[PDB]
């Protein structure tokens, strides 16, 4: 898709945005791509994961939710409306988007539009509160009520699809078409007014059901099952692991760049036996004042070598001035960048890019001359 390596290499705007956002990449990008002539595609080929990270930092979006339900007031009441919040109103309610499009660049502005919408009956009906006639609403926004009902019918048009017979409740009630039993009592029908018309309680149920169906259907985009779903997984066989087993041969070859006899071994052993029995004179461990001197010389030379090695071991301070310090640091940085690109093109093993290999070798020779 758009996350592939060639798309990230050709995406000039995304590279430029990541380059503006990052600061330490100035000191690598500035003298290599521009001053030293390295191709930007070659520069970003090694930093494809950084490009992919900056791509996925902004490409992902928050999932749909009932943003008008999260919005509640807190005399003066105040509410907070962020851009991601108002955009959430924009996808979850396209009627508000249609209200935005023909109004905010033509007649009147964003904050007074949102004040009119939040004071209108359309906000209450989209939130799911029961609409009653004594509220003023708003005259500009309340003309969109019929359009919102039209959009509700249109939403029901592509939401309505035949379902499986496992959950086909319409088939469940039409299994007997000529059943004519007792009509159930008033607790089983939707509530009615004094005149017998609907009280609108079923309308908010329809609205929240349609809202959930819209949220689930928004997940379904480009971004025999009855047997499996009625099968009892507990009564089947337990899962058998198919992990591979390894047997290691320890017959490794020996490392490559005077056998004593048992008789003389027993003689040496018996010598040790009698030398242990007769006397173990521990005072014999004391050296004879010359081998001890040689031993101490060897040990102190080893100590001197190790102390000179590990006397000294955030970067450490340098005797250079700071200007020459970052001059040498940026020259070493472009040294390492050119070396990395040369080694990748050298070990790629393709004859079609040997010209690029030769160009990078000439860059390395110029780099040697610059050093």
């Amino acid at each position: 898709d758009s996350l592939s390596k060639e798309k990230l290499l050709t995406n000039l705007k995304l590279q430029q945005s990541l380059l503006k956002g990052n600061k330490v990449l100035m000191k690598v990008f500035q003298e290599t791509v521009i001053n030293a002539g390295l191709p930007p595609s070659e520069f970003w080929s090694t930093r494809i994961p950084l490009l992919r990270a900056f791509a996925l930092s902004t490409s992902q979006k928050v999932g749909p939710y009932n943003v008008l339900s999260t919005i509640k007031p807190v005399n003066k009441v105040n509410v907070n409306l962020s851009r991601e919040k108002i955009l959430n109103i924009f996808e979850n309610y396209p009627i508000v988007k249609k209200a935005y499009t023909d109004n905010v660049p033509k007649n009147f502005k964003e904050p007074e539009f949102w004040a009119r919408f939040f004071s209108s009956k359309l906000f209450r009906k989209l939130r799911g509160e029961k609409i009653m006639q004594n509220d003023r609403g708003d005259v500009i926004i309340d003309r969109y009520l019929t359009l919102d009902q039209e959009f509700d019918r249109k939403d029901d048009d592509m939401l309505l699809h035949p379902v499986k017979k496992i959950i086909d409740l319409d088939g469940n009630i039409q299994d007997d078409p000529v059943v004519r039993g007792n009509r159930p009592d008033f607790t089983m029908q939707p509530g009615v007014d004094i005149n017998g018309n609907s009280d609108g309680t079923v309308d908010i149920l329809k609205g929240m059901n349609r809202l959930s169906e819209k949220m689930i259907m928004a997940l379904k985009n480009e971004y025999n099952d009855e047997r499996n779903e009625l099968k009892i997984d507990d009564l089947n066989e337990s899962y058998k692991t198919n992990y591979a087993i390894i047997h290691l041969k320890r017959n490794a070859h020996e490392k490559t760049t005077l056998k004593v006899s048992n008789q003389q071994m027993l003689q040496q052993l018996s010598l040790v036996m009698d030398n242990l029995i007769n006397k173990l004179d521990l005072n014999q461990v004391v050296p004879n004042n010359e081998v001890s001197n040689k031993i101490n010389k060897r040990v102190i030379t080893a100590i001197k070598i190790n102390a000179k090695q590990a006397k000294h071991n955030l970067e450490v301070k340098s005797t250079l001035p700071i200007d020459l310090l970052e001059s040498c640091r940026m020259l070493h940085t472009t040294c390492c960048e050119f070396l990395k690109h040369f080694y990748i093109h050298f070990q790629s093993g393709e004859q079609k890019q040997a010209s690029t290999v030769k160009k990078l070798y000439n860059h390395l020779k110029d780099c040697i001359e610059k050093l």
């Binding site: 000039l12 430029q16 380059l19 503006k20 100035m26 500035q30 791509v33 521009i34 930007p40």
Partner: peptide, 21 residues
């Protein structure tokens, strides 16, 4: 400086756009 190196980025983007053009 940030202003001048963003100017260098703008000049390089203009050069690239000329390269496709």
């Amino acid at each position: 400086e940030e202003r001048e190196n963003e100017k260098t980025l703008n000049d390089y983007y203009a050069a690239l756009a000329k390269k496709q053009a």
